[PDB]
């Protein structure tokens, strides 16, 4: 899938300065070109510039000349980029790749904005007592008020994988709002649980939700 | 800068056709063109370098061709996970540039979605607020409406939507909807709908519940 390994995801005010890491793991870091690359959302890729470890060369796209600054450190076979007096035009996946083979970064998503950090509510979605008794049953999490980017959200701590479709979050305001679904036989449940899991480190916060059928 | 236009910009076909995407550039570039593939919320993956040599591990339905400004990207049989986004480069002159992408969906027997409605969880009604989540789910094609009803009239403000990417499994496609409100508001009213009109049917699914029971 994956080969290089970069830094993890940025929230940093306008007019400051990010540092992404690109970790490139082999004996021969300073023979192979690291490309950088910009995609935001709706856009497509737009190329940043290279660098070769060890030569002192370096190209930058004449569009991100003051806005990029490349470095390398041969002896951790580590390439970092520097981005600059950010704005929200900033705000958008990164990614690295070897110029050779499929080599690529899993990318890195930075997000320009002075909005506060704001941990998640994390609500139940059980089916209304009009419970229609077809063979599956469908389940969610609403995942509400939260910034930034990103939750990860989980079902039984990873066990339950098929039938889960966790939406892209929206941004209405400063607040990101996101739903998981998941559908499951209909005898299992409620007998055996299920149970939402959504992590927000930038908030340093996780919440575990039992769903649970509605009382009354 | 050179540009680099891809043909078509999005493009739908089905398992085992032959598929066929054009990359040209506004200036020659003496075969120096790459083709990446993206999927959705993954990163770009290298298919094919210098025209039409594949990278390692690649499998042999693709193919690349061209010279000068007219570049192709071949499939000769395709698969579903060949779904995705499509991207070419050219590195002939800096700065680099890519094309701004084929976006490529596979072709798949209708269905309708599978919808389910939700009442705002006694949780958030604690907070005062009242989100009512509607799921379609597993739904082909892509298009779709959903319109909510507050006692039989129709609602738009407060409503918000997320759309799923193609899924990898069954190439269908799913849709979640959340009409939030006040804790007053949701109080005062009695009738909450969502319907969802797909290609599949003239006649709305529609979901629904009554605030009085639990
Ligand atoms: O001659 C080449 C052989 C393999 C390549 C693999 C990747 C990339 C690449 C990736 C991201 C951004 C720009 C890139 C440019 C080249 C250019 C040549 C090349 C390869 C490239």
């Known amino acids: 899938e994956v080969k290089l390994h970069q830094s993890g995801a940025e929230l940093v005010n306008p007019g400051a300065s990010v540092k992404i890491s690109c970790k490139a793991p082999?004996?021969?870091?300073?023979?192979?070109?690291i490309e950088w690359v910009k995609q935001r959302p709706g856009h497509g890729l737009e190329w940043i510039g290279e660098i070769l470890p060890g030569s002192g060369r370096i190209n930058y796209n004449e569009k991100f000349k003051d806005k990029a600054t490349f470095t390398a450190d041969t002896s951790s076979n580590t390439a970092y980029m520097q981005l600059s007096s950010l704005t929200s035009d900033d705000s958008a996946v990164y990614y690295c790749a070897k110029k050779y083979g499929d080599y690529w970064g899993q990318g890195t998503t930075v997000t320009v904005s002075s909005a506060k950090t704001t941990p998640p509510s994390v609500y139940p979605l059980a089916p209304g007592s009009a419970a229609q008794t077809n063979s599956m049953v469908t389940l969610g999490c609403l995942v509400k008020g939260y910034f930034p980017e990103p939750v990860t959200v989980t079902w039984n701590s990873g066990s339950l994988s098929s039938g889960v479709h966790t939406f892209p979050a929206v941004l209405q305001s400063d607040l990101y709002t996101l739903s998981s679904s998941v559908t499951v036989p209909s005898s299992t449940w409620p007998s055996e649980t299920v149970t939402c899991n959504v992590a927000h480190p930038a908030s340093s916060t996780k919440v575990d939700k039992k769903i649970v059928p509605r009382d009354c | 800068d050179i540009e680099l236009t891809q043909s078509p910009s999005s493009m739908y076909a089905s398992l085992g056709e032959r598929v066929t995407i054009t990359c040209k550039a506004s200036?020659?570039?003496?075969?120096?063109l790459n083709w990446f593939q993206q999927k959705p919320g993954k990163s770009p993956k290298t298919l094919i370098y210098?025209?039409?040599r594949l990278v390692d591990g690649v499998p042999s339905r693709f193919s690349g061709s061209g010279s000068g400004q007219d570049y192709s990207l071949i499939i000769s049989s395709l698969e579903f996970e060949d779904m995705g986004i499509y991207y070419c480069l050219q590195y002939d002159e800096f700065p680099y540039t890519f094309g701004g992408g084929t976006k490529l969906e596979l072709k798949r027997a209708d269905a309708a979605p599978t919808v389910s409605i939700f009442p705002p969880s006694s949780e958030q009604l604690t907070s005062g607020g009242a989100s009512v989540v509607c799921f379609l789910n597993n739904f082909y094609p892509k298009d779709i409406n959903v319109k909510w009803k507050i006692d039989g009239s129709e609602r738009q403000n407060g409503v918000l939507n997320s759309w799923t990417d193609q899924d990898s499994k069954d190439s269908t496609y799913s849709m979640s909807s959340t009409l939030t409100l006040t804790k007053d508001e949701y109080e005062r009213h009695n009738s909450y709908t969502c319907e969802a009109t797909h290609k599949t049917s003239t006649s709305p699914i529609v979901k629904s519940f009554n605030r009085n029971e639990c």
């Open positions: 082999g004996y021969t870091f300073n023979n192979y070109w």
């Open positions: 210098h025209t039409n």
């Open positions: 200036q020659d570039i003496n075969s120096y």
